[PDB]
DNA sequence: GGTAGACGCGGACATCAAGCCCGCCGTGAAGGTGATGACTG
């Protein structure tokens, strides 16, 4: 099981990336809490903040600024006529934002 | 207020050297989201 170093580089990499965030006036709880909950509570943050998002292929955020709606998640079908192809006959190398 | 019926050929067209430097190019506004935090009727 040599695939936990990704969890190490996700936890300690972000914890060491907070080295420029240095405030010598009021960091006396922020630095300690960041070092504590940046590793152990990071799974809790990635569980509670894993349910705000979704995979998409028909997003509506790119058509209005704050249009809170429902985005599609499935590819369109095949068009039954000859001579016009688009966002359904695209390849299997797709990427869901 | 007259038709009439025609307009040429040949030949040739310059070479040389050169084309700048210096400084500079503006600022302001154009982020949504939960998550408590304060208010609360």
Handedness of CA A16, A11, A27, A51 (dihedral sign): positive
Which positions on strand B lie below 7 Å from a protein C-beta?
Answer: 31-35
Q: Which two tokens stand for residue A61?
A: 């955020």
Strand ranges in A1-97 using DSSP code E only, listed in sequence order: none
Method: cryo-EM
In degrees and rounded to multiples of 5, residue A71 shows phi and psi of: -95, 145
Q: Which two tokens stand for residue A5?
A: 């170093």
CA A8 to C1' B9 (Å) is 102
Which letter does DSSP use for residue A80 in this model? S
Tokens of A89: 């006959």
For A72, list phi and psi in degrees, rounded to 5: -75, 165
Resolution, angstroms, 1 dp: 2.9
3-class DSSP state of A50 = coil
Q: Does residue A48 lie within 7 Å of nucleic acid chain B, judged by its CB?
A: yes
Distance (Å) from CA A85 to C1' B35? 45
Q: Running DSSP on this structure, what letter comes out for residue A58?
A: B
A28 Cβ nearer than 7 Å to chain B strand: no
């Amino acid at each position: 099981q040599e695939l936990r170093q990704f969890i190490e580089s996700f936890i300690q990499e972000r914890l060491q990336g907070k080295l420029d965030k240095l405030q010598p006036d009021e960091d006396d709880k922020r630095q300690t809490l960041l070092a504590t909950h940046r590793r152990e509570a990071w799974l809790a943050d990635a569980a509670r903040r894993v349910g705000q998002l979704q995979l998409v292929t028909h997003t509506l955020k790119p058509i209005h600024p704050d249009a809170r709606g429902s985005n599609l998640h499935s590819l369109p079908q095949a068009p039954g006529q000859p001579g016009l192809a688009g966002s359904h006959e695209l390849g299997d190398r797709l990427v869901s934002d």
